[PDB]
Design an enzyme around this catalytic site. Structure first.
Site, PDB file in Angstrom:
ATOM      1  N   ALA A  60       0.813  -1.216   0.000  1.00 36.13           N
ATOM      2  CA  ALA A  60       0.000   0.000   0.000  1.00 36.13           C
ATOM      3  C   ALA A  60       0.849   1.269   0.000  1.00 36.13           C
ATOM      4  O   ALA A  60       0.439   2.280  -0.581  1.00 36.13           O
ATOM      5  CB  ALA A  60      -0.946  -0.006   1.198  1.00 36.13           C
ATOM      6  N   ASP A  61       2.029   1.239   0.630  1.00 37.42           N
ATOM      7  CA  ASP A  61       2.869   2.428   0.714  1.00 37.42           C
ATOM      8  C   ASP A  61       3.449   2.846  -0.631  1.00 37.42           C
ATOM      9  O   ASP A  61       3.970   3.963  -0.739  1.00 37.42           O
ATOM     10  CB  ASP A  61       4.014   2.214   1.707  1.00 37.42           C
ATOM     11  N   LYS A  62       3.377   1.988  -1.648  1.00 37.33           N
ATOM     12  CA  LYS A  62       3.818   2.355  -2.986  1.00 37.33           C
ATOM     13  C   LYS A  62       2.774   3.138  -3.765  1.00 37.33           C
ATOM     14  O   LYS A  62       3.108   3.679  -4.824  1.00 37.33           O
ATOM     15  CB  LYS A  62       4.199   1.100  -3.774  1.00 37.33           C
ATOM     16  N   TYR A  63       1.538   3.218  -3.277  1.00 37.99           N
ATOM     17  CA  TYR A  63       0.418   3.785  -4.017  1.00 37.99           C
ATOM     18  C   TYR A  63      -0.176   4.987  -3.292  1.00 37.99           C
ATOM     19  O   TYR A  63       0.075   5.186  -2.098  1.00 37.99           O
ATOM     20  CB  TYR A  63      -0.658   2.709  -4.239  1.00 37.99           C
ATOM     21  N   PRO A  64      -0.942   5.827  -3.992  1.00 44.14           N
ATOM     22  CA  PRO A  64      -1.600   6.988  -3.336  1.00 44.14           C
ATOM     23  C   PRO A  64      -2.601   6.543  -2.283  1.00 44.14           C
ATOM     24  O   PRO A  64      -3.038   5.383  -2.284  1.00 44.14           O
ATOM     25  CB  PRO A  64      -2.306   7.708  -4.498  1.00 44.14           C
TER      26      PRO A  64
END
Ligand SMILES: [Co+2]
Ligand SMILES: [Fe+2]
Ligand SMILES: [Fe+2]
EC number: 1.14.11.38
Lengths: 285, 284
Positions: A60-64
């Site tokens: 999730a931390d790779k995405y907005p």
């Protein structure tokens, strides 16, 4: 254009197995009753309502922040763990599909929600989580099967999965044109089954009314391949409430690749893992 | 006739890597000190003296009673778990060898004893535990490495391992003669390192008297490949006494196959397994 075949739950397993080798994909119509689908949706709603944690989140931390994702749904959605995961039609298909490789188990099962305004995925193969799969030849025993659960309607406008039939026989993905694909338009409760190496793309969602398309993806793999999601932190009480089949799918039992592995895999002390753990199961008797 | 290259424990890793792609194998001389070899042997003597089991043994029951075998020595032999498993030279080789596939971990490490009068193994490759390895092209990133620890002397009498150099480039095993192989004759504390696809065979043991030949085999695999032995029933105190590297080798941490896997493998709740478990380690 030849379309994806839609089959009733009582359909012939040999037929389904051959559909996967010729077309590479097919749809099971109305497998899950609507009460199961809606129970599953409500459990998923609970998970998406949870405020985001303070700590690291690997995907999730790779995405907005608007990214909609629920990992490993079997630990938080009792409907998946106790009903969807052990559906006997799915496992009849898996057992026929995986006949040459031997046992399979669940590598991952997770929710994605695609909002209005999202573009379609590039065409690809599902060979990224276990990159060694990219080098397996077509004639090798398959080690992966994609099972795609629509939890809302899949329509032409909202991004029904695009599948290029026969494309598992291609050398590379290349840059195929969209009109080479057919659409897995579906109602909730249907199931889309996609063979290893089949070129496909999520369709995004081109509706503008604010209605998101919801999908759960389940990857069943040869027990030779490490599960992406590990279910080893499940409480014993939860593990023991499942059936043997469920325990096997979630990595809690010793499993068997085909010969020439004549011993098995996922064992300890030269014993079966469920014996060392003295694992009970709901349907032991 | 080309022989197995014998390298000092402190030799250059680039040279060890050229050997694995050219010969497919080599021998590290004197990697483990004598005190490590002796205490390891003492820890295995304890397991060897455990009375015969009352239940099924998945592997042992498949073979006749002269099968001496100690599974998953990591859980019963501290010297292996705290010293041999994390040896920095072994891991320098592994990191270089697995660079293309990404992270690796321990699939199995176990003891075998081979008594007098045992015939040699048939020539084979180590592709049976994970049969999908049989179909990988020669050019594809290797996903397996064999690390062989002699715990007694390997001699030409007692059945030093037979290795056919360059045979990882063969299309099939075929029917190779014994005189196509060279012998991994070693002292305890040496290490035999064998590339994936290399044709080889246990030497058996042509002696008539003497104690059995003793060998510990560790198979290191890409983390894409499911470990044969699962170390998940190790107690938390035992797991948290190990180093980070030890915990990674034994499946207690999230790992990373190479791109295009950009998230990792062996995680839960979209988090690292060690963070979900709040795992301490000796060196963190
Ligand atoms: Co000859
Ligand atoms: Fe995909
Ligand atoms: Fe071997």
């Amino acid at each position: 254009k030849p379309q994806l075949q839609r089959l009733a739950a009582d359909a012939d397993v040999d037929r389904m197995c051959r559909l996967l080798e010729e077309d590479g994909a097919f749809i099971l119509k109305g497998l899950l009753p609507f009460d199961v689908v809606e129970s599953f949706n409500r459990e998923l709603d609970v998970q998406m309502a949870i405020p985001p944690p303070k700590g690291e989140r690997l995907l999730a931390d790779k995405y907005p922040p608007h990214f909609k994702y629920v990992p490993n749904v079997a630990t938080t959605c009792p409907t998946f763990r106790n009903t969807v995961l052990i559906n006997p039609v799915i496992h009849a298909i898996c057992e026929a599909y995986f006949q040459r490789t031997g046992d399979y188990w669940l590598s991952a099962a997770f929710l994605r929600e695609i909002e209005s305004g999202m573009p379609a995925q590039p065409f690809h193969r599902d060979d990224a989580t276990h990159p060694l799969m990219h080098y397996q030849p077509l004639e090798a025993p398959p080690v992966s099967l994609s099972v795609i659960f629509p939890l809302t309607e899949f329509t032409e406008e909202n991004g029904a999965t695009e599948v290029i039939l026969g494309s598992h026989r291609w050398t590379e993905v290349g840059t195929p044109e969209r009109d080479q694909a057919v659409l897995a338009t579906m109602d909730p409760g249907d199931v889309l089954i996609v063979r290893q190496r089949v070129v496909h793309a999520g369709g995004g969602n081109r509706t503008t009314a604010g209605k998101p398309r919801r999908v759960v993806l389940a990857y069943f793999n040869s027990v030779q391949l490490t599960p992406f999601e590990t279910y080893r932190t499940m409480p014993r009480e939860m593990v023991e409430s499942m059936t043997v089949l469920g325990q096997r799918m979630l990595g809690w039992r010793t499993m068997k690749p085909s010969d020439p592995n004549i011993v098995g895999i996922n064992l300890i002390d030269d014993k079966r893992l469920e014996n060392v753990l003295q694992l009970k199961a709901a349907d032991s008797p």
